[model samples]
Target: SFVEMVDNLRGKSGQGYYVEMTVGSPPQTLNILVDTGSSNFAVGAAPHPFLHRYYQRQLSSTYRDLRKGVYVPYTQGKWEGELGTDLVSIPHGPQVTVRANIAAITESDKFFIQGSNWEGILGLAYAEIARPDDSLEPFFDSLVKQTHVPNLFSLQLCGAGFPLQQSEVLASVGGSMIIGGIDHSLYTGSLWYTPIRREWYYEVIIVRVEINGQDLKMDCKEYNYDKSIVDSGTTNLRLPKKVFEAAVKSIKAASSTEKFPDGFWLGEQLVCWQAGTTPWNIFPVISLYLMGEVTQQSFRITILPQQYLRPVEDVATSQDDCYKFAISQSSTGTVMGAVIMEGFYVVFDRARKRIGFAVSACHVHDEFRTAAVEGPFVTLDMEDCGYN
Candidate 1:
């Protein structure tokens, strides 16, 4: 297997887990966000208030304007760009050079928010969701076809559990994105597989959710209200309205305290404890039961309290350490984002039509357990778990 490993960094100097890519003729190096929820490979072509720099496409001899306009609307931001083709390659990762679709974003709204460091987005998604039309191939598809690598990729994000201070953003931790194969060293135990319910957004089925072993006991379909997806671009684990409510209620009671304020749960305010102390022990472990390849089977992926209670070190008072809730309510379906993903080594095995999860090696020497994967638990009578 020809596995090309790309170095990734989160928090420090980037808004999301991002990697370096060389684009255009002279090989203008740009830091691109590795997003799984979207499929358009785009970069800033013009200057913006929030962007520190952008791709100077005019300077590249190989850049060709396709002349088609493209627009991508994200949950938080949106951008409009001109479609084009250019030489794209991962400088130190995938060495194969190929002509790939690139969107030169001329204008954007909130896409490049404050504190962001990346200049472009490399969407690692299926071509079915590619912008302008499904006919437009995604960057990864182009790379795989031209490079003759297997349609398999894996991600390991290590920058979770601890909040990065503003000063620490320049000294961030590193993760790895295996472009063509799974890195066994990045994970532990047996890999658990779940069928991809939909071709777009790496959709999957969440059969159940448990807070501290207490099942939410809602209809399995509720977790998949419309559809559930594993999106690396999203920062938090978002649940459908009812599912989110149940989670909040369960978690509040699990803490066994009335002091768990609404502002904190609603993300309106951050909770804090004395320096060197954490309220992790008071929070419960959250487990998501993913329907297996076989309808009757399911497995659990759990994140310890430390994973969801992200610290806000940048503004923490000298006397107290503050934390924010990294899980939120979604208007649509459940979204398994980086908050939960950082705990596991996730494999986007498009060739097999299944996604795999294993305990990430990044947590191997942690002070305490941060994440886990277990069980092929039989899920008898779980109807419509994978609704279309």
Candidate 2:
């Protein structure tokens, strides 16, 4: 999932950006945004009430009309639009372009914002904000079907520090979705697969957590992983307060550091080895257990960069700091966002009721072959359970 935005604009103005993507046989040109939070693709459209004025100015003649774009009520506001087929372009690929669809909203608020560098958003999440019956199929899902492959899609987000460098990131669609099968070149054979709930997202059932080899006996109800979403768009591993504290305590004890603030500060004293010559390679590993036949396939994500594990105090005053790290208890147990998924390739298989993973190489053209299912594969419909 990626978000496309305009760059180096002197003022707040929407700019028209185009990418090359393959639809069927021929290449086509389509506007796209490099959205890390979304797992699907969507195009922009013409003038509307709620539409940002900057986006209106960038409207192209080739814009497709959404007979009835689906409505998505977000915590911020509501978005309604339609989808239509068109051509898309990419910077590099087999086909210079491909035929695709754009989601156009007829009614939107007008705003004078600067998006002079971006065109539209391309989401990489399992579920699109739009309804299933909407005219345009989810971008990533469409690629899965067109490629005629089962399993999951993967992404490896790489770049400098905060405020990512757009030109350096990479995304690939339709690789493999089977568990126990992965591209060794991209990963170190430490990939973890989890089962998803049959709800709005690819939900995982996290039984417990082991931080730094020590398990925290917190109230299970406070750390419910049932509602956790494996979102590619979010940038951090956000967890509820109770879970965050327990995990922090375990880390602090393992490192033998004095508590500095809401969490431990990863100083040399805390991470020193019994011998002064060697430093304790004390990187915290959080093991997340899932429910399924492949219980061992659970993902063991690393907690690193130190900054990401710091706790936020004085929530009322430190709003910005509050959102900076994982282990944060906001509304519920925890939200494992992009921070945990950055160096991995996560595949969402709604058809198989499982989520898969692999190491990401950040290259788009690498080829991978996965294990095949023996005998005839049975098809299952999860739409009835709200996945549609």
Candidate 3:
């Protein structure tokens, strides 16, 4: 795979992760979260007048302030900005350089705070979904048209390995995003492909779901909200209230722990627990059956105990620990986030208007660790820990 840049991003709580991108003509670099959830390439902080690295439109000669103001509402808060355009480039990838739309944020309601490590967001969804209706094309769309590039991209997220320890929640792992091609070694077996049901997101059919080995018996015909968008932006899965509640009930039905009204936050999960033991032994594997477009074939997302244990930090102490599902009740009904995507190799093929997935190599061996040190893209590789 032709990777231009691989950045190591860790959350403030060491829970979230992101990457860095080079923007502008002379290229002002910034740490940004690669979001498959939205489509807005914005940067800098206008609210913090004292902020030094504010996206200075004046610094880049190719910068153009369109004078158009835009506002985006998020579950967290609102992101307000001025619309503009500038020549954006991906450091090592020349084909990605384009006069991309820029959203110079004037302020963030709360998500973006002072001295935040990240400067802005780089959205990967279609332009139609972008707020303010700028008809602003995303970086990927622009890169797809190039003859030398493929209309596909892949993401492999690795962190927190087995034996379920208390420190995994705060640890960082080797992560990589491959653009324009696929990494055969990142995953084993044939890749399962699914059609895009919607233009806005990576919509796919999850025909059925099961907890442990038992079928969830979800009545899709009665309420067919079976299509879920794969979003890397959100840490937890957002499900229909009823579905979410049911999943939570199933996890807890097996056993009971003290009710933690406000669950603790892990790297990318919200968890609840009081046991000084690993939840891996108790929780069951969640199996999700996905439908294929052409062959009408079927694939499954087998979330092992490791993927679903729901790791988090303790309130009394910062010790990493974990719990009963920390899923959120979503207005849209269903969405798959990083929690479910962590161990899979996901490919977005805009050319075919489809997406693909396969079991990741993170659990296979030391490929991720080795690549982090010797590969083209690597921002951080925590040597303190080892995968089992």
> Model 2: residues >4 Å from true position, as ranges?
1-40, 46-64, 69-73, 77-83, 89-101, 105-118, 125-136, 146-151, 159-183, 219-222, 249-283, 295-299, 305-327, 349-351, 358-388
Which prediction has the highest lDDT against the true structure?
A: 1
User: lDDT of all the models against the reference?
Assistant: 0.81, 0.41, 0.61
Misplaced by over 4 Å in model 3 are 1-15, 45-52, 92-96, 113-116, 160-174, 221-227, 256-279, 316-320, 363-388
1 against 3, candidate with superior lDDT: 1
Put down candidate 3 lDDT per residue, 1-388, tens digits, no spaces: 4434332433331234456567666778876767788888878746364344667777788888788888887767987888888876655344456677788888777666444356778888998888687376776776665446677778777644432222432354446677777777677666777678777867665655667657676664311254478887776777776766676677666545533333421224356444555545455566666655644345566666565444444555454454435456676746777756765778888888888777777732231221111111221221111111
Give me the overall lDDT of model 3.
0.61
Which pairs clash in the backbone of model 3?
A: 8-379, 15-267
The 10-residue segment with the lowest total lDDT in model 1? 6-15
Better of 2 and 3 by lDDT: 3
lDDT of 2 by residue, 177-259 (tens): 22212334444444455666643455665555566546565443445633566754454566666676676667656655433
Residue range with the least summed lDDT across 10 consecutive positions in model 3: 370-379
Over 1-388, each residue of candidate 1 has an lDDT whose tens digit, in order, gives 3334744554541267778888888988877888898888999999988777888988999999888998778757789999999998876576589899999999988787667577888889887888878899998888888888778888888764455654565576557788878887888898999988779789988888899889899889889998899988887899999999989988988887537578889987888887766656777889999988876888999998666776676463566778788779998788898778878999999999999999987752236556889988986756576665
Give the per-residue Cα lDDT of candidate 1 at 282. Answer: 76
Q: List the pairs of residues colliding in candidate 1.
A: 12-169
RMSD to true structure for each model, in Å: 2.3, 10.5, 9.4
